[PDB]
């Protein structure tokens, strides 16, 4: 493959063309054009582990968007990154106030 230089496996060719021509830096001079794919592999692996754990539980084997919404709201680093996003095909965090409650 063209990605196994440092444990990566995502496609490189089109990614090499895009990162080299990212239109944001004049030249990536020594230089980590593959670090975008590195963080991409990192996120893919963490999503793999989380989704496997979620699907394997609930006595099922599939990921319902409810589970992914719960996982997205679960993390704190993702909340600090972009905390102004919501997940569709699910529901809001359940809530009842003790003052609302009888």
């Amino acid at each position: 493959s063209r990605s196994a230089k440092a444990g990566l496996t995502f496609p490189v060719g089109r990614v090499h063309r895009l990162l080299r021509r990212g239109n944001y830096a004049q030249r990536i001079g020594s230089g980590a054009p593959v670090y975008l794919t590195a963080v991409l592999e990192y996120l893919a692996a963490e999503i793999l582990e989380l989704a496997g754990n979620a699907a394997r539980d609930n006595k099922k084997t599939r990921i319902i968007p409810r589970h992914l919404q719960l996982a997205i709201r679960n993390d704190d680093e993702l909340n600090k990154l972009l905390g102004n996003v919501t997940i569709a095909q699910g529901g809001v965090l359940p809530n009842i106030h003790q003052n609302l409650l009888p």
Binding site: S3, T9, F10, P11, R14, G22, Y24, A25, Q26, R27, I28, G29, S30, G31, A32, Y35, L36, V39, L40, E41, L43, A44, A45, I47, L48, E49, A51, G52, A55, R56, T61, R62, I63, I64, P65, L68, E77, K80, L81, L82, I87, Q89
Partner: protein
């Protein structure tokens, strides 16, 4: 056409051999991974223009500050 899915399942086999996931999770993966790519590219664009030094440290600073 082009699918990251095969590489994703390669990493899964590195982690878990016989687990199945859903397609909606794959679409959300596409969206969030690509917007992370856009944000990380946007963050490390003109940092090399902050001072007259215009690499790896640009994206390193990007991941340092977004996280």
């Amino acid at each position: 056409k082009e699918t990251y899915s095969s590489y994703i399942y390669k990493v899964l086999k590195q982690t878990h051999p016989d687990t199945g996931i859903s397609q909606k999770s794959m679409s959300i993966l596409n969206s969030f991974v690509n917007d992370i790519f856009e944000r990380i590219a946007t963050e490390a664009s003109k940092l090399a223009a902050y001072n007259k030094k215009s690499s790896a440290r640009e994206i390193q600073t990007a991941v340092r500050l977004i996280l």
